Design goal:
about 400 residues; binds a molecule of 2 linked components (NAG-NAG); metal-binding (chains A, B, C, D); exo-alpha-sialidase activity (chains A, B, C, D); binds calcium ion; Neuraminidase; four-stranded antiparallel sheet; signal-anchor (chains A, B, C, D); homotetramer; binds a molecule of 9 linked components (NAG-NAG-BMA-MAN-MAN-MAN-MAN-MAN-...); transmembrane helix (chains A, B, C, D)
């Protein structure tokens, strides 16, 4: 009955962003049984789109919320839940157990991947059709880790980018090509990106583009472009001087295409872009110093043009509100002739920026592109920290 | 498999109203995780009827309920939930994000529309089959806004009435004709209605009738009648001297067919009527001054007869209980030979009438017509405000 | 696809009773969002069996639980929920609004009936396939009321017994014959039963037997036997001197077949029996004075033999625990060659017997027959009232 | 459409264990409506795998949690719920009522068995396709009891092991062979096992292997091997000197194949093994004295070789964390050419080891085998008891 999805369409023209989903999880969880989360994303099946994140295995009001700034424990799991509801104890479906994930539907069924273990002995389990199929042991014994947003499939082949090794020098990044949860091939990273974490990917016209985080050196973002038929890839950086990691230095006039733009070391944030010629939009935090604010900038030819500057933009979160990770997804099963770019922003609340509470959590806002030039609003998390004291 | 619904039936004869649904949301939410709402309605799919409303993105007992008198924020969404259950965190399905909505099923799938943004830069997103399809930017830069109750479709064409512009003088009302979430046509309001907000619509014999709110001048209600095949409409007022907005002056002996009946300016409430010759019933608040009580009056030829008075009635909510918005819907997929008129009343609790609590919310009661002459009960919200202090 | 169910089987031989379902609702609702209920029952669809009851439109821990001894309000509804779960805010499906009900599946879909209104102006609404179809106005203007347990259908015809009029003298009982929610016929009660309330019915070999409550005079129970093909009935009393209403006098040696067995006036409890020759079992409270304890007694030929005494029995609830209403149901869609008799007991907690709390609620236990002679346990509600203070 | 499952595959090669599911129930239930449980397990249907356990009919934070160390009451039920969610009031489906259970899917539908009653008069009810079909009365009048983990079917025949009689001397164990919930045959235990409780079973190549608990004498575990076609069985003990009950004496150099290995009397814990030649893995608690820690040991030929020692292992729960019962299950409906061994560990919290709280409950962790040699983590319950004081 169902066939594997093929990436046959190009991106729709992005003239602005419209609201798609928002869960208000922190506001609602002040007085309801909402799980503490972080590292959220969005992903569609052929008949539904859902929110996803890594639970911390406690509610926000629960006493076990104390300590949830920590990224890795035995109490995390990848959960999904209905679009724009909050992640509650009673509506959250566990996809797999662990503290680093990705997930994508191939048109027939869903693959989900969760990594668990101690830092020196982690392993991935690849689930397909809600059953475990393949396992991969750590190859560098230092926090095996993956995208924290959806993967993308083409004719059953779903590439996934993993890293294992240091966060503050060269590491061992691998691109795995899965089909029905089995490994067809893997390759080591090639090209000019010097460090890769937390790739945010999308597909169009039989090519998958991933915008990642160079935690080690780069305040420009590395880009991996994957051919899922040939099962090959390239890597470079976004050439534009509109720098989109965080923290970062101020924007220069000329960026770097094949090396990290320097100025900030050993830090970053997961983020994304859509790189499609003149139809190119970059997300970034507004602040250069912290995970505050969020904006989209139209930067024609950002990938290839080392002097490209914005020609249009849209504020998503004011710089007086907290943001966080951000990532790409699309509804590959929508009607019409083109794929509509979407993204989400994780709105982090609690530690370390708001340390009067003992927890860290987030809510989600997400937007998709419009071919209209729509008015803009800002979309904060909306919770009052003082209510939790 | 499924075909678009056609409005092939006339209304059943309304000889009284029977109880259809009631959620007791405020009573139950005193000690359960019920979302704060307002602007509720009811709408049917071919296999289920559901309650809908605009959440405020907090529970009633939650500390974020403080401030929920306010109509527009980034934390509102259109939600639906099973008939007569309350809107809870765990059972409420988000249809779209925003602070003004409508929704209707065309026989194949559902269209939902939500407007969001700041007052001077709002936009509608039209969702079809649970995906975003079309967007419309504000045309007058002043609170783009729509029905707050269900739309109606005929052979796939679902007209929707929007207003943008002042609430206290001429505004720019448009009737959009959607099919599969795409715009076939729109037209500016024509006819003699001088201001339109919050239309309540129903269909019968290939005609859609909408009873709306003239916020600017009129205490009689404007009526828009739409031909969804020709995609044309007319407008006038209910001619009857039984005035049905709120607040309003006392009832005269002769009303106005083609102009606002004066006496109250710059206010109103969403309401409804069924206008079908001798089979005409009007809803209204009992109080002329405030949103208290609710009654149905049988007013033969109310639309056309400027001296028409009641010949029968039914009390729905006593004048010592709070009411609120009211609106029309029908189950277009029921058995039998005629469409059974239904309506709901929003029972508003909290601010501004009950200001010992810091929140505003509501529950729902809803009734449908019977061809019997049934005994009447009154149907209050039923919550005790003192329990929330 | 689906056909109407026919009553083609006889009862299985009842040699003891096994546990079927129990919800522990009061225990669990001490610290979860469980609705206050009373007047529960059980009813099966072709693919699932569910618990049903009349909600009071509040949780047990909620402040609106104060006052829930009262039987009739605008905040009651017939709800159903999964077998042996408790009736919670989040899992309870409302079937219809009102304070007296019955419900049954005909093999194609379900009919549910709810009565609402003030005592002098009540009305029934008959829902079929989850939509309202027919309405019936009060005929005697004194608490129109029905079974409070499931009805039974045969080839689409579902008879239902209603009463309207005094509870303490002659009233007007009617048997309605519904098909697809429409009235085929009704008849006034005939035969020798002198007053009827709250009938508990079951079907076998194309005959429906209902055991009811004579509130006015009788401590023996009236029995109505209905032919759903001819749409006729008879009535009499259980002849046995094993008296099964409550309160009641002590058991005599000879009962009454065609008149109320006297000794207690103007009170009773809903109850049931299976009347099948030697395979006859009667339920009753153990106490003659109050709704405490519950037992089944095998009383061969109880219906017809005015000296019949027990030959076997089973204790269901000890006389040191509270009971309440009880009623019959069967799974008419089970495998095998005979219908397995089942029943439920309502375990009432709170007022008036336990008046340190301000509420009245209940839980459910239910049993079905076995052809084995099984060991017996007792099945109390299990909640500690002191925990609610 | 569906056919009965046949055990046509052998076990996959077990080279390590990967995380499969974990519910964090005690952590989450500190501030959400999680039921108190014990005696959990896991079982798959053709389209889903679920967690199961015996509820205690109260939440953990509820006042009725006081006293839940006790094993048998009228308020217990077998519940199931989605894999890795916690067992909550709102998501837990009751399978049947009682205080000892087993359940398995035959490829067409599920059989569930629950035993209830007082110790001297207990009875099993066998449910098939969610309806009661057969009942079995106590044969020895002393705590009729069964596996507390899943049964296994082959071509519709689902053997189940029961015991009735003393826990501290010879008892009466029976193997029942069910098909469609009916009894085809039963046999008394034969072979050399001298006492049997709480068998943990799995199937491969048309043979079912059960590893049980000799509560009376043995610190080695008894093994029952069942031929579900011939409906015959054998019994012996695991010959290995790697002793796997608890409490137990220290490991000797030579075990016992046909008699209990002595040293500890009248106690034990439910546990499991996979016995497949060199592909043999045994679970056990790390502590010899208490239910603390959990490890898997690869013990080639453990069943048959009375000097077999470990050649590989994996720690599952550190010896500074509490464990509990453990049991086997597999997904018999997975893809591929072999059945992947899985197990669960019950992580008991509260009494008697943690007696500052008044309750006993547990959470679940579960693992399945990998053909990789994966890094290991430990998987504690994760709750802080002090938060519950
Ligand atoms: C109702 O809603 C609508 C729809 O949302 C609202 O309209 C939106 O309004 C916003 C806000 O104004 C606009 O976003 C900004 O867009 C500009 C880009 O547009 C300007 O530039 C265009 C390019 O000009 C150049 O090239 C063209 C050739 O292609 C040439 O023609 C031109 O002369 C010049 O050489 C112009 O084309 C464009 O004009 C067009 O549009 C105008 C409407 O906007 C119209 O008036 C014109 O007639 C014409 O049609 C326009 O001039 C972005 O540049 C801008 O983003 C910068 O600024 C914000 C702060 O506001 C900052 O956060 C951004 O990061 C970015 O600035 C940083 O980075 C730059 C790049 O390196 C750097 O140069 C800056 O110094 C700055 O860097 C500093 O901050 C960063 C961030 O913290 C830090 O990292 C650095 O280190 C450093 O510290 C905004 O995105 C929307 O485009 C506009 N949308 C639409 C459709 O109109 C409307 O306002 C609402 N109505 C109401 C009443 O509220
Ligand atoms: C069990 O349940 C049943 C079923 O519900 C209960 O029966 C229901 O009882 C109620 C309450 O009585 C009825 O509702 C009222 O209905 C009347 C209309 O019916 C009267 O008028 C009919 C028309 O008479 C005129 O025309 C005919 C020709 O067509 C001519 O024949 C006649 O002589 C005259 O010229 C009569 O036909 C009708 O008689 C029939 O029915 C009688 C039963 O009701 C029966 O006894 C008769 O034999 C005959 O069969 C009857 O006389 C509505 O007028 C009325 O609503 C007005 O009053 C309420 C206050 O009660 C008010 O809230 C309404 O807004 C409305 O009055 C306001 O507006 C008017 C219009 O502008 C204005 O004129 C009024 O001054 C008033 O205005 C003021 O208040 C408003 C609102 O606050 C404010 O805006 C203004 O500014 C101003 O301040 C009720 O709807 C049901 O129809 C009736 N149903 C049935 C089927 O019987 C039964 O009672 C229950 N039993 C028990 C024991 O409780
Ligand atoms: C493990 O579980 C098993 C299975 O559950 C347990 O076994 C069950 O045990 C219970 C309790 O004993 C039994 O229930 C009682 O059953 C008797 C009926 O059986 C007796 O009578 C039979 C009829 O005898 C007469 O007729 C036959 C001819 O048909 C003739 O042969 C005979 O001589 C005589 O003329 C006997 O056949 C039967 O014997 C058989 O079974 C015996 C086992 O029980 C066995 O030992 C024998 O060999 C033989 O095989 C037996 O003698 C019911 O009468 C009884 O119910 C009455 O008593 C209870 C109080 O205990 C009361 O609550 C009931 O309401 C009822 O008594 C009231 O009503 C009567 C009727 O009007 C009245 O006469 C009484 O005075 C009394 O009235 C007072 O109280 C009521 C209520 O408050 C009030 O309204 C009145 O006004 C008044 O104040 C019990 O139901 C089960 O049948 C039995 N089941 C099985 C399969 O064995 C086993 O015990 C458990 N094991 C353990 C270790 O716990
Ligand atoms: C990243 O993750 C990986 C993967 O998990 C981690 O690697 C795992 O590391 C663990 C911990 O070391 C290993 O588990 C232990 O495995 C050993 C078995 O392996 C040893 O023995 C093998 C057999 O040797 C004998 O036979 C062979 C012939 O077949 C012969 O060649 C040999 O000379 C000898 O005669 C060796 O083959 C094996 O070597 C191989 O593997 C090595 C890696 O482990 C490698 O270095 C070698 O080159 C070679 O490749 C190895 O030597 C188990 O014996 C052991 O379990 C015992 O000990 C633990 C305590 O640690 C205890 O809890 C167990 O119960 C058990 O000991 C009890 O029972 C025994 C049996 O009766 C008894 O003899 C003991 O005295 C003891 O009894 C006491 O305690 C019990 C329990 O409380 C009580 O009941 C008794 O009464 C008494 O008080 C562990 O299971 C994994 O196998 C290994 N996995 C893999 C794939 O490598 C890696 O460490 C992680 N990395 C980091 C950085 O953390
Ligand atoms: C995606 O492209 C693949 C490759 O062309 C399509 O695969 C074919 O699908 C049909 C079944 O629908 C098979 O009978 C062919 O044998 C397949 N060919 C190959 C080369 O695998 C697939 O159908 C396309 N997906 C969609 C949604 O059309
Ligand atoms: C119950 O009995 C009725 C009456 O005999 C059966 O009704 C017939 O059903 C078939 C469809 O399955 C029709 O084509 C006939 O016309 C029906 N006859 C009548 C007289 O109504 C019904 O099928 C029986 N129900 C079951 C479950 O067999
Ligand atoms: Ca960086
Ligand atoms: Ca007005
Ligand atoms: Ca709560
Ligand atoms: Ca009586
Ligand atoms: Ca033992």
């Amino acid at each position: 009955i169902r066939d594997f999805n093929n990436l046959t369409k190009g991106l729709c023209t992005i003239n602005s962003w419209h609201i798609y989903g928002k869960d208000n999880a922190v506001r609602i969880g002040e007085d309801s049984d909402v799980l503490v989360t972080r590292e959220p994303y969005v992903s569609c099946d052929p008949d539904e789109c859902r929110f996803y994140a890594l639970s911390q295995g406690t509610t926000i009001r629960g006493k076990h919320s104390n300590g949830t700034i920590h990224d890795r424990s035995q109490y995390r799991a990848l959960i999904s839940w209905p679009l724009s509801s909050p992640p509650t104890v009673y509506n959250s479906r566990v996809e797999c157990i662990g503290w680093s994930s990705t997930s994508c539907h191939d048109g027939k069924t869903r693959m989900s991947i969760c990594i668990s273990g101690p830092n020196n002995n982690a392993s991935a389990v690849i689930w397909y059709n809600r059953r475990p199929v393949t396992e991969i042991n750590t190859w560098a014994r230092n926090i095996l880790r993956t995208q924290e947003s959806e993967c993308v499939c083409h004719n059953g082949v779903c590439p996934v980018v993993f890293t294992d090794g240091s966060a503050t020098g060269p590491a061992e990044t691998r691109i795995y090509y899965f089909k029905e949860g089995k490994i067809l091939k893997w390759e080591p990273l090639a090209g000019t990106a010097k460090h890769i974490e937390e790739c945010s990917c999308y597909g169009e016209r039989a090519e998958i583009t991933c915008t990642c985080r160079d935690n080690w050196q780069g305040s420009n973002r590395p880009v991996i472009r994957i051919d899922p038929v040939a099962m090959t890839h390239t890597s470079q950086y976004i050439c534009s001087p509109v720098l989109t990691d965080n923290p970062r230095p101020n924007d220069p006039t000329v960026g770097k295409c094949n090396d990290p733009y320097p100025g900030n070391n050993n830090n970053g944030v997961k983020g994304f872009s859509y790189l499609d010629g003149v139809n190119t939009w970059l997300g970034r935090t507004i602040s250069i110093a912290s995970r505050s604010g969020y904006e989209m900038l139209k930067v024609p030819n950002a990938l290839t043009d080392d002097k490209s500057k914005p020609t249009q933009g849209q504020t998503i979160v004011l710089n007086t509100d907290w943001s966080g990770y951000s990532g790409s997804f699309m509804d590959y099963w929508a009607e019409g002739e083109c794929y509509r770019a979407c993204f989400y922003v994780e709105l982090i609340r609690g530690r370390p920026k708001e340390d009067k509470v003992w927890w860290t959590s987030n809510s989600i806002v997400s937007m998709c592109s419009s071919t209209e030039f729509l008015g803009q609003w800002d979309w904060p998390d909306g919770a009052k920290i003082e209510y939790f004291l």
